[PDB]
Design a protein around this nucleic acid. Structure first.
Lengths: 94, 180, 94
RNA sequence: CUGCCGAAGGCAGAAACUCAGAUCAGUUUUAUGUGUAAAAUGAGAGUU
RNA sequence: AUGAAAGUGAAUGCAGGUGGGAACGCCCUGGCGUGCACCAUCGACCGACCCGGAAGGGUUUGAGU
RNA sequence: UCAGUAACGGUGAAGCGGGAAAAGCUCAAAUUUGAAAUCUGGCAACAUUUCUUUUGUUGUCCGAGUUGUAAUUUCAAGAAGCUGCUUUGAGUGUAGACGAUCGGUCUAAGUUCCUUGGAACAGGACGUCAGAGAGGGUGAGAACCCCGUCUUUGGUCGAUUGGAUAUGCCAUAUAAAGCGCUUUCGAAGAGUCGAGUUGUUUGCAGCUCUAAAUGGGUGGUCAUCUAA
């Protein structure tokens, strides 16, 4: 509204669409690096605590599985990031 | 530990000689580069205009000069700054345009003005940028006639409403999401 | 100066700045006051307290009946209809 | 070095302005019982 | 300037009146005006406190207009 | 300057704003696969020098190197196609001008008269120079006796160079690069981030444990950056 106070506070000008900055991209999953990550995955295996999570999930005790995963990593977002990845591996193995 | 300033006139003289030596060394070109017009990033100083570090890639491309040759002819380039409004865009664009219009480029190898150069270059003279490109301030509004709908418009009554809307924005934000 | 001390005779003896409407016309130069104040013009003078370094305008003083437009971020409660009764309008700048 | 002011067991001085006063007194009379009140003499008195 | 803080954020009434008040003027010592500063009063306004839903009511408040 | 403010329990910033100075970049991560195109060293010439003292060039041999040296790419991008415009040397002598370093060398006028005195460089008289009346020495207070001082941001010597101008000779472009489009893909740093604990003044370290790829860090779903 061209106003100093409000949810759209500030001046009103003609807004310009900024060109895409390449450093914003990092974190993207290229097909080639995804393929290489697949190869190392099938050639290296999984860490010992991953194997315990497989056993925990195959036993269907998900609460303890996420609790110990958070204890191993340190953050809930990392624990969730693990869980979806190893369950995703689970149906692939099945 | 004390820091005394008995070398203040000495420092001032040394800086002036360094400027003088710089001018003598690179006399054909101005001793200060072109700088873009840039607005300070705060509510206390957003009403002013000062000299930024350098132009952006979008401004350089819109003006028609490439980012590679821009450094060579003396146009500093900032790769971090971005233009979020056309008002700043054509503002810096017209700064470059007037710079280029007043700019003369000596041909290299002194054989012919290959594409972008100057045919006659005997009129060389060292002049500061500020004279040709005097950075200005925000345009001060001149007198305008009385607006009738603005006259009916109260003023801070609105600022009270959008304020109350802002403070209790989460209050109704909850209200809709919980009832929906 | 040590010579005029006491020991020389003891020898041997052991962000929002604000402005009131009384000062609004002061902000305009002398030319603007001479060519707009005290006369009837279809076009009205505009006062930008923001460009003069003032965030809010407050309500101490009177005004001449000459209409004037006040550009500001915040304006005082009855200072608004002080402008309106003076004939001007407060147009809010963003 | 000289001169002036000068204590204390809240003081002495400085500056800012009252009233030519009934305004005060390490005092004495008068009246009521050392207290209080309203003639003598002296002093320019003061207030923050 | 006030408020713990968001914040709000000042001459009603010659930028309010009364008395004293320096100086001045007027006569005809005194009286008359006349009133600076300042001091006693004094109403309003800005707020923080309370009631009312901005107006209005407090005789609470700030080295405030 | 913020500011002795925020903050902490006396300690004590930073953002913004005004100035001084300014300049940007380089790798790893992708095949040159029609060609290791790369590089140190040995040997022989050719040179060049602040320099017989320095620094290189070419040819040949061996070695390094495919467990990756060259060219292209560094996220601001970029690569691969497509396009039609523009651009081009990591060179080698001659001359003048333009600066600078080193030391060589150049500079105006009383020593006239009288008195005092051991001595005049003092006093008095008569004169001079001054872009030079700063300073020092000389038998006492010397602009004119001497050195210097001004001229000098200069004339004259030489030896160097730093950068440009004019001029000559080599180079080899069958190439490289910039710009607008994509019908395309866009690789990006690990015992590292992070969490718990102990220690030091958020930052750092020890130890248990240990990541992700629109992910991660920072600030209050958003904004901004892209570490190891």
């Amino acid at each position: 509204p061209g106003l100093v106070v409000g949810l759209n506070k500030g001046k009103t000008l003609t807004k310009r669409q900024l060109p895409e900055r390449p450093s914003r991209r990092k974190g993207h999953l290229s097909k080639r690096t995804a393929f290489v990550r697949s190869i190392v995955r099938e050639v290296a295996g999984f860490a010992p605590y991953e194997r315990r999570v497989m056993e925990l999930i195959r036993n269907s005790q998900d609460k303890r599985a996420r609790k110990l995963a958070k204890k191993r990593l340190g953050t809930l977002k990392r624990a969730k990031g693990k869980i979806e990845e190893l369950t995703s591996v689970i149906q692939s193995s099945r | 530990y004390v820091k005394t300033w008995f070398n203040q006139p000495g420092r001032k003289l040394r800086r002036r000689q360094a400027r003088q030596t710089k001018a003598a060394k690179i006399a054909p070109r101005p001793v200060e580069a072109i700088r873009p017009a840039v607005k300070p990033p705060t509510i206390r100083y957003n009403m002013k205009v000062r000299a930024g570090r350098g132009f952006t890639l979008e401004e350089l491309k819109a003006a028609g000069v490439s980012r590679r040759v821009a450094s060579t002819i003396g146009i500093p380039v900032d790769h971090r700054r971005r233009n979020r409004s056309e008002e700043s865009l054509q503002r810096n664009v017209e700064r470059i345009k007037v710079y280029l219009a007043h700019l003369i480029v000596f041909p290299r190898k002194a054989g012919q003005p290959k594409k972008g150069d100057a045919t006659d270059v005997s009129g060389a003279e060292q002049t500061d940028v500020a004279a040709v490109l005097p950075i200005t301030q925000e345009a001060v509004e001149e007198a305008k006639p009385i607006t009738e709908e603005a006259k009916n418009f109260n003023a801070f009554s609105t600022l009270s409403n959008e304020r109350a809307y802002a403070r209790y924005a989460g209050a109704r934000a909850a209200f809709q999401k919980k009832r929906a | 100066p040590t010579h005029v001390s006491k020991t020389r005779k003891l020898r041997g003896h052991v962000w929002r700045p604000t402005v009131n409407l009384d000062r609004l016309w002061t902000l305009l130069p002398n030319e603007a006051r001479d060519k707009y104040l005290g006369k009837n013009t279809e076009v009205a003078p505009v006062i930008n307290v923001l460009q003069s370094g003032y965030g809010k305008v407050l309500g101490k003083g009177r005004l001449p009946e000459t209409p004037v437009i006040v550009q500001t971020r915040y304006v005082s409660r009855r200072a608004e209809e002080k402008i309106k009764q003076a004939g001007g309008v407060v147009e809010l700048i963003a």
